[PDB]
Amino acid sequence: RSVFSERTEESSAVQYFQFYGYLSQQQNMMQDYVRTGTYQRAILQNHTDFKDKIVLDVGCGSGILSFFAAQAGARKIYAVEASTMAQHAEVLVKSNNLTDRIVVIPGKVEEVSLPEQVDIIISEPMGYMLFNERMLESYLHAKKYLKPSGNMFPTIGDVHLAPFTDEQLYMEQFTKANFWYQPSFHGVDLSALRGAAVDEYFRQPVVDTFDIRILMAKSVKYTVNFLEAKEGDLHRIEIPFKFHMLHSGLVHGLAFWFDVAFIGSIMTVWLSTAPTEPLTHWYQVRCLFQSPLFAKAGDTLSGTCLLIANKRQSYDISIVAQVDQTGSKSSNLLDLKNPFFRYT
Amino acid sequence: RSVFSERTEESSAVQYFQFYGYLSQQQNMMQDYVRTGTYQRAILQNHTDFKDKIVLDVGCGSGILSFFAAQAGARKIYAVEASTMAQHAEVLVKSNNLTDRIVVIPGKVEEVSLPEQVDIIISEPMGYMLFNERMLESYLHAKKYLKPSGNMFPTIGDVHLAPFTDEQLYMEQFTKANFWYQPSFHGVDLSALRGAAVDEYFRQPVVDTFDIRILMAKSVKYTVNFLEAKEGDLHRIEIPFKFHMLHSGLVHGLAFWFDVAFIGSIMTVWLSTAPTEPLTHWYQVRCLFQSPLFAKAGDTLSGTCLLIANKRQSYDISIVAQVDQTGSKSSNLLDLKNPFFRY
Amino acid sequence: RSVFSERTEESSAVQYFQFYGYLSQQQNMMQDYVRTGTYQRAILQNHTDFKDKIVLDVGCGSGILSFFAAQAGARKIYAVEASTMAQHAEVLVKSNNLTDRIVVIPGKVEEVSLPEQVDIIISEPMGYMLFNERMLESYLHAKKYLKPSGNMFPTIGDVHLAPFTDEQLYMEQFTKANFWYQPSFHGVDLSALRGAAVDEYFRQPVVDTFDIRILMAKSVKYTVNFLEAKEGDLHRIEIPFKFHMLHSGLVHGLAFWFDVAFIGSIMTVWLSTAPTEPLTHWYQVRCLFQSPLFAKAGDTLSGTCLLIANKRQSYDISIVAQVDQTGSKSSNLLDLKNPFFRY
Amino acid sequence: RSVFSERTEESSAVQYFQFYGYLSQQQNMMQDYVRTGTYQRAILQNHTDFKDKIVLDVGCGSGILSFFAAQAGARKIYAVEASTMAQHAEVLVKSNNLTDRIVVIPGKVEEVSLPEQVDIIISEPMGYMLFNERMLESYLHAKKYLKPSGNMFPTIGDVHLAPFTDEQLYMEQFTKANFWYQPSFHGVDLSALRGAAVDEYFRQPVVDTFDIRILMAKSVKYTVNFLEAKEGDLHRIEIPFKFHMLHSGLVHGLAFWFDVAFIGSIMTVWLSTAPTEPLTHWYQVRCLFQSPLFAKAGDTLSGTCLLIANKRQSYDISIVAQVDQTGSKSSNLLDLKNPFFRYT
Amino acid sequence: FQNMPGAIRPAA
Amino acid sequence: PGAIRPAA
Amino acid sequence: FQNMPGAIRPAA
Amino acid sequence: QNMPGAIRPAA
Ligand SMILES: *C/C=C/[C@H]1O[C@@H](n2cnc3c(N)ncnc32)[C@H](O)[C@@H]1O
Ligand SMILES: *C/C=C/[C@H]1O[C@@H](n2cnc3c(N)ncnc32)[C@H](O)[C@@H]1O
Ligand SMILES: *C/C=C/[C@H]1O[C@@H](n2cnc3c(N)ncnc32)[C@H](O)[C@@H]1O
Ligand SMILES: *C/C=C/[C@H]1O[C@@H](n2cnc3c(N)ncnc32)[C@H](O)[C@@H]1O
Ligand SMILES: *N1CCC[C@H]1C(N)=O
Ligand SMILES: *N1CCC[C@H]1C(N)=O
Ligand SMILES: *N1CCC[C@H]1C(N)=O
Ligand SMILES: *N1CCC[C@H]1C(N)=O
C-alpha cells in the first residue's frame, strides 16, 4: 500500500521497472548529449544552490545526476531508485569514492524513508510528451522531503501544442489499414475488419520528428510549476487552446513537445525538445485528428486537449478541435502508452 | 489454477496477449507470405487429412488457419484464441458465411472446454528460435482433445545449431558494452560496471539474418516430435553438440534456426527458417560468446546447449562450448525473452 | 664524468651508436630527399654564413653536412661522430680530396677535445617527435665551442600538437591488447593481465603519417631557440595547451610534428615534418588516449604535455587532457623510446 | 659472478630481457599456433611424464608451458623467468588458482636457487637458426636440477643445412649497395664506400621463407642431444657438410632450419620449422656466399659451417664451401645477431 | 532499439 | 512495445 | 613488428 | 626491414 501502488497496475509497474533495469537503457539516456550535458550545465553553473547543501535525486538510475550534484559541492545526496539499477548505482558510488556524500536508497520514492529534509530535489521525470510514465507525480510527491525554502531542478515544465499539416502521415494510416480491404486474402474476405484496423491506427500517437514547416500556428503553452503543483494537478490535465492560424491548409492533428527550466540562484538553464532544437531521445509527439480541418490563415482553431491519467503509468488523450469561422469539427481519442515509433 | 497459470507470471501473460490483440500484429504475421503461403500449401495439398474431419486450431488469432481447414473440407473447426483477437476472428467467420463450420472458443487452450475430440490439431506455436513463447507446451497440451491416431499440423520441429564467425557483429555488441569502460564520462568513472554491461549485452540473442558463409560446421539437429512429446519434455531441453570444424578461424557463437514439417497423408510440406531459405519474420537467432574461441579446420567443438523454461513464457539459455584439441572453453547465459532485433 | 655518460645508461648508448654504425642506416637517412635536399639548400643558400668560417658538425655520420659546408666555402670543418661511422666519413673525406678542410674527430661531442672555437654549428639532432634521442642536449652542449657571434643550423625548433580522431587506429591497438582478455587461451585464463596489456600497448607512441582531415583543432606550438637554450632546459619540458575544437567527435589522442628553421644571414630555410608537407623519415607521432574524449565544436580541450628526460636517451611523456565543458578527463603515460612503427 | 654474466655483455643482456618484458612479445609467440599447439600436444599426450612429477620451466615467460604441465597433472612446477614478465606470470598463477602447484622464481636460471631436484625440464630455448640467443646453454645449465634419469622437453634438436639457388636475393645485395656507387650524390662522390656497403649486407643472415624448389641438395643434419650435451659443447659448433648436388646451377648460399623432438614415455612429438612445414615465427635462415659456386648435378659441395658463440647472446658464422670437381671456392662471415628480415 | 521487451514476434 | 523511453 | 627497441630513426 | 633488438621475428 502506497501512493504509487494505489495508482498503478502491478503488471504495468513490473514491465516499467524491468525496462529501467538495463544498463543499455541508462546508456541510451546518458548518450543523449543534449539531455546529459544540459543537466550538468544547470547543476554546475548554479553551484551555489548545491554547495554544502542536502540533495534528493528522484529516480537516479545509474546515479549520474547525483554525481553532477557532487561535482557542484553537495554535502550529502540521497539517490532514490526503484529499479534494479539502484544496485549498479551503489557500485559507481563506491568506485568513485563518494560513499560519504551519496547514499543510494533502493525503492520507490513514495515508499522509502529519508532521514532528513533536503534543500533541493533533482530528477529527470519527463517521459515523451512530458507526462508519459506519470513520473512527474513522483517528483511532486517527493516534495514532502523538501524544506519550505527548498528548490527543485527542473523547476517548471512547459508542454507545447501546435496544429500541423502532414497529408502523407494521414493517408499512411489508411494505406496500412487497407490491407484488410481485400475480398480474397488466400481465399478469405478480410474487409469486415478494415474499420477496426483504421480505428486502431488512429489511437496511436506518433513518436518521431518533423520539419517545423508543417506547423501552422504559434504553439500554446501549458506550464507546470513544480514548486507550486500537487500530485492531484496531473490526474486530469485540461489544456485549452485557441490557435491563430499562420498558414492556410488542412490541419491533420496536434504536435507536442516540452521544455523544462532549471531556475537557479545564478542563472536559468533550459532543456528543450522543440522541433526547432537539436533532436533528443524524447523526439516529438503528434496526435492525428480523425478528420482534417480546413483552416484559412487568420482563422482560429479552438478546442481542448484533455489528458486523463490511467493506472498504466500513462494517459488517455482526448482532443477536440474546431475552426471557429466555419464550425467544422473533429476529435480523436488516443492511448499514450502504446505509440507508434515512426522515426527511421 | 490452470496449467498455463501455474507456469506463467501474470505480468508476462498480460503483455503477451496484449501484443496479439493488435490487428497490426496479425497483419504483420499474415503478410509473411512464406509463413502464410506455406501453411495454406500444407493444409490444402493434404486436403484428405481435413475432409469431413473435426479440427482444433490452437492460437487461431484472426482465424486464418481455420479458414484454410474450411477450404480443405473440414466438417467443424474449433478455433481457440486467448487474446482479444478472438472477437475479430468471429467477425471474419460471419462475414465469410462459415458460422456452420468455424466455432471460435475464446480463451486459453488449457482452460476452455470442447464438446468433442478432434481428428487433427493445427497451430503456429513457433516463436523465434522455435522455443520462445513456450506455446509448444500449449500445442502439446491440446493433445488431450486429440483422438487416438490423430494428426498434428505441424507434426515435428527441428532445431538447428551451427557455429559461426562474425567479427562485425561481435565488435558491434562489444563496442556498445565498452561505453561502460569510460573512466571519465562527464567526470564520472563508469569502468566498475564494464563487466556487468558485457554480461547484459551478450545475454541478448541477436535476431536477424546472415549469409550462410559465416557458418563453420555442419549443423546439429534436435527434433521435437509433437505427436509423441509431453509438455513436460520442454521444461528442460538439453542439446549436446559435437561440431567438426570445416574452416579455421574464430567461433563467435552459435547460430539457430528451425524447420517444421507438416506430415500429411498426401505429402510432407516443410516450413523452414534456415538462412538458405527465403527470409521469414522469424529470421534467425545467434548467441554470442563474450570471448570467441579459436578453432582449426579438423578440430571438434563440443558442449551442450541447455534451455531452461522460465515463468516469462521464454527460456534461459545456457551454452557451454569447448575446443577439444586445446581445451579452450566458453560459457554464456542468454535471456531469450529480451533479444536484440538487428535487422 | 662526461656530461653524456652522467645522463645516459651504458646499455642504451651501446645500442644507440650500434644502430648508427650501419651504412644501411646512413643510406636510409640520406635517401630522404626532403631532409638531405633541405639541409643542402639551407647551407648553400646561406653560403656567406660559411665562407671562410670555422664549422662544427655534431653527429656528422658519413659527413654529408660537412661536405655541404665545404661546398659553401668553409675554411675548416670539425666533424664529430661517436659511432663507427666516423671511420667511413674519414674515407669519404680522402676520396673527395677534402683532407685540407674536413677534419673528422671521432667520439662524443661531450668528450672530444676540439682544437678551436667555431663560427657556426651544424647538426641533425632531431629524433622522431623532435625530442627522442636527447641529441638536442648534445647540440646545445656543443655551444661551449661556439664563438659569441656564432650561429646554429638549425637555429630553432617548433613542436606542434593537435588533437585527432582516428577510430581505426584506436581499435587496431585496443584489439591487440584484448588478446589478454581471453578467459581460456588454450584453457588458460589471461584476463587478469588485460589491464596491464592496455597500459603497455597505449604506452607506445604511434609513428606513421595520416590525413590532415583527422585533426580537430588548430595546433599549439612550443618553440626551442637553440641559440639561447641551455642543456638543462630539455630535462623537463612542459607544454600546456588549450584547443578550441573545430569539429565534433571523439578525440582519440594528440598528434605531434616538428619544424626547424635555419635562420641564416641571407634567408631562413624551413624543414617541416608537418602532415601538410611532403613525408620524411620522421613521419609524425600520435599519442593515444586509453579512452577517447567526446568534444563538441566550440568546446575547449585543455591540459598539459609533460616530457621528462630519462637515462635511455628519450623521454617519459605525460599527457593529461580535459574537455572543460564536461570535465571529461584523460591521462596517459607513454614511453617515447619504444614506439609502434606503423608505416 | 654467474655462468650467465661471464658469457654475456651487460648491454646485450639489458636489451635482451627488456624485449621479453613486453606482453606484446609473449603474445607474438603465443599466437604462433604451430608453436603453442605443438608444445601443448607434446605435454598432454605424454601426460605420464608429468602426472605427479616435479617440473622446472626455464624461461617460462608468461607461464603458458607451466600451465600445460599443470593441465597434465604435475605435482609442482618451478617456473624460472629473468625478465620482468615473471611478475605477470605470478598474476596469472594467482588468477588461475594454481599458487599451490606453480611457483614463479624471478631470475636467471644460472643464478636462482631451487629447493629440490625435478623430474623433467621444459623450455622453449630455440632462437632463429636454433642457436641464436644462446639460451640452449641455459637449458643445458639447468640440468644441475634434474634428477638422474630425468627427461627434457624438448629432448633433442636438429639443425638442417642445405644449399640453395636464389639469383634475385644475391643480386639484391648489390642493388642496395650500389647506392654508394655514384660520383655526385648532392655533390659528393660516395663510390669509395661501395665495397664496405656490400660487405655489410653480406654479413646479414636473411630471415624469411622460400619455395623448397630452390634447394639444390638433400639437407645435412647436426643434432644436439639436450640430455647429453654440455654448455661448453655450444661455444664452438662445427658442422661439416658434403652435399651431393641434385640440380645444376649457381649455389648462392646455405639455408637453415631446425626441428626439436619431445621424446616422451608415450610418444615422440616433433616441432619442425622446415620449409616443407607450416610457417612459424622462426621462419628459416639463409646465409649467402660472397661469390656463387657453379655446380652440376652429381658434383659434391663440401666445406664447413662454423658457429662461434659471442658475448652478444648469438654467434659469428663462418661458412666456407668448394665444388670438389672444380676447386671453385667461396666463403662468408655473418653476424647472426643482426639479421635482415625479408619476409613480406 | 536495444530493448523491445514487449515484441513477442519479430516484424516481418 | 514496452519501450518506455524512445531510443536516442 | 610491435617492438623495435633498437630502431632509433624510422625507415624512410 | 632490419630487426635491431627484436630477438624473435614477428609471427
Ligand atoms: C524517466 C526516468 C525514470 C527513472 O526514474 C525511476 N523511477 C520512476 N518512477 C520512480 C519512483 N516512483 N520511485 C523511484 N524511482 C522511480 C525509473 O526506474 C528510472 O530510473
Ligand atoms: C505465435 C502465435 C501465437 C498465437 O497463439 C495465441 N496463444 C498463445 N498462447 C495461447 C494459449 N495458451 N491459448 C490460446 N491461444 C494462445 C496468441 O495469442 C497468438 O494469437
Ligand atoms: C639523429 C642523428 C644522429 C647522429 O648523431 C650521432 N650522435 C648522437 N649523439 C652524439 C653525440 N653525443 N656525440 C656525437 N655524435 C652523436 C649519431 O651517432 C648519428 O650519427
Ligand atoms: C626464446 C624464449 C626465451 C624466454 O626465456 C627467457 N630467458 C632467457 N634466458 C634466460 C635465463 N638465463 N634465465 C631465465 N629466463 C631466461 C626470456 O626472458 C624469455 O622469456
Ligand atoms: N520481414 C520478414 C522478412 C524481412 C522483413 C520484410 N521486409 O518483409
Ligand atoms: N536518437 C535521438 C535523436 C536521434 C537519435 C540519434 N541519432 O542519436
Ligand atoms: N620513408 C620516408 C617517406 C616514406 C618512406 C619511403 N617510402 O621513402
Ligand atoms: N608470423 C609467423 C608466420 C608468418 C607470420 C604470420 N602470418 O602469422
Side-chain angles (χ1 to χ4, degrees), chain H:
Chain H
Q1 284 188 338
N2 283 6
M3 36 186 287
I7 307 303
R8 302 273 188 110

Side-chain angles (χ1 to χ4, degrees), chain A residues 21-66:
Chain A
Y22 291 105
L23 290 170
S24 57
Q25 287 308 321
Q26 284 297 303
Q27 176 172 350
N28 177 63
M29 297 175 290
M30 295 161 63
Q31 288 193 305
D32 187 325
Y33 183 87
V34 181
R35 177 262 203 183
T36 298
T38 304
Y39 262 92
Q40 185 181 40
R41 234 170 292 120
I43 290 172
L44 275 292
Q45 291 175 347
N46 292 290
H47 49 91
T48 61
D49 297 323
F50 297 85
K51 186 68 171 57
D52 297 321
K53 303 294 174 61
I54 300 173
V55 180
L56 168 57
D57 185 352
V58 182
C60 65
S62 60
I64 301 300
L65 298 179
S66 293

Side-chain angles (χ1 to χ4, degrees), chain A residues 32 279-281 283 343, chain F residues 7-8:
Chain A
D32 187 325
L279 195 62
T280 75
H281 77 283
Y283 298 84
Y343 187 70

Side-chain angles (χ1 to χ4, degrees), chain B residues 49-77:
Chain B
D49 291 308
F50 290 87
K51 189 192 171 198
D52 289 326
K53 302 288 188 299
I54 308 303
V55 183
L56 170 57
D57 185 347
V58 184
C60 67
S62 61
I64 191 70
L65 297 181
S66 287
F67 292 104
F68 297 167
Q71 298 164 4
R75 179 196 162 202
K76 209 94 157 295
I77 304 153

Side-chain angles (χ1 to χ4, degrees), chain B residues 129-131 157-162 218-223 239 243 254-260 270 272-275 285:
Chain B
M129 207 187 254
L130 184 65
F131 294 115
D158 290 325
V159 200
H160 284 256
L161 298 79
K218 176 141 185 295
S219 60
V220 169
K221 188 209 289 170
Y222 178 90
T223 299
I239 302 171
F243 295 105
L254 307 187
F256 295 74
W257 63 88
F258 68 88
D259 316 323
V260 298
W270 286 91
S272 173
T273 65
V285 195

Side-chain angles (χ1 to χ4, degrees), chain D residues 23-320:
Chain D
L23 285 162
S24 56
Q25 289 309 322
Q26 287 298 307
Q27 177 175 346
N28 177 66
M29 298 176 293
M30 295 166 70
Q31 293 176 144
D32 182 337
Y33 184 86
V34 182
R35 175 265 199 178
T36 304
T38 305
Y39 263 88
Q40 192 183 31
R41 283 187 285 105
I43 294 171
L44 291 178
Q45 297 173 201
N46 291 287
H47 46 85
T48 60
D49 282 271
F50 296 83
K51 187 173 86 170
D52 298 330
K53 302 290 188 181
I54 310 297
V55 178
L56 167 58
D57 181 13
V58 181
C60 67
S62 60
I64 180 162
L65 302 187
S66 288
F67 292 115
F68 296 161
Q71 291 177 3
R75 172 190 148 114
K76 185 168 285 294
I77 306 163
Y78 297 100
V80 183
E81 170 59 47
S83 78
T84 62
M85 188 58 57
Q87 268 289 84
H88 296 140
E90 182 58 81
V91 169
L92 295 180
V93 169
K94 285 192 180 68
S95 56
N96 284 267
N97 309 284
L98 288 170
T99 60
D100 283 30
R101 290 211 282 158
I102 300 173
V103 178
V104 175
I105 297 175
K108 312 180 177 58
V109 67
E110 295 78 355
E111 299 173 2
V112 302
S113 56
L114 257 58
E116 59 180 342
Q117 306 297 76
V118 309
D119 295 285
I120 180 164
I121 301 173
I122 61 175
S123 182
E124 180 192 57
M126 301 92 70
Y128 54 78
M129 221 189 69
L130 181 61
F131 300 112
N132 187 55
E133 302 191 49
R134 294 186 65 181
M135 186 172 163
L136 292 181
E137 300 178 51
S138 303
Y139 188 46
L140 298 180
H141 180 95
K143 291 196 295 192
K144 66 183 184 181
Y145 295 121
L146 189 61
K147 294 182 186 181
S149 84
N151 204 0
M152 302 182 79
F153 265 31
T155 317
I156 70 172
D158 299 329
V159 60
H160 286 259
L161 306 74
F164 69 85
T165 179
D166 192 332
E167 186 68 40
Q168 289 173 312
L169 172 61
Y170 182 87
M171 297 188 302
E172 150 182 329
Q173 310 312 315
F174 297 91
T175 298
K176 293 188 287 187
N178 281 347
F179 163 80
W180 301 92
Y181 201 63
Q182 48 182 308
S184 178
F185 172 84
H186 295 255
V188 185
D189 188 331
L190 301 177
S191 68
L193 294 175
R194 193 271 198 162
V198 175
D199 293 337
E200 174 179 299
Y201 286 127
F202 274 86
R203 287 183 61 89
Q204 293 193 267
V206 177
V207 174
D208 72 345
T209 190
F210 47 81
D211 197 289
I212 61 166
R213 283 173 296 197
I214 71 170
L215 305 176
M216 311 186 78
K218 179 187 186 300
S219 67
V220 169
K221 188 179 77 179
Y222 179 90
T223 297
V224 180
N225 182 339
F226 300 129
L227 286 171
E228 307 273 67
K230 301 264 159 287
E231 291 189 66
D233 302 342
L234 303 176
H235 300 171
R236 178 191 179 276
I237 305 166
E238 186 174 18
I239 307 178
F241 53 83
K242 264 188 169 297
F243 299 112
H244 306 279
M245 302 301 290
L246 302 176
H247 309 285
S248 305
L250 298 178
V251 182
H252 294 101
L254 300 182
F256 295 76
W257 65 89
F258 64 90
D259 311 322
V260 301
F262 307 85
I263 304 176
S265 301
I266 292 167
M267 71 190 304
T268 294
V269 170
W270 283 89
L271 177 60
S272 171
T273 63
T276 51
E277 298 288 341
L279 195 62
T280 78
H281 77 288
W282 291 287
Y283 298 83
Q284 292 90 36
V285 178
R286 285 185 287 171
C287 296
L288 290 174
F289 291 131
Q290 287 177 352
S291 295
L293 296 171
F294 171 73
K296 312 187 175 205
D299 287 344
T300 60
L301 181 70
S302 66
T304 58
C305 171
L306 178 60
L307 315 182
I308 304 167
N310 60 40
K311 290 201 180 301
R312 293 167 295 124
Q313 293 172 283
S314 194
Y315 288 78
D316 321 296
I317 299 175
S318 166
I319 298 164
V320 336

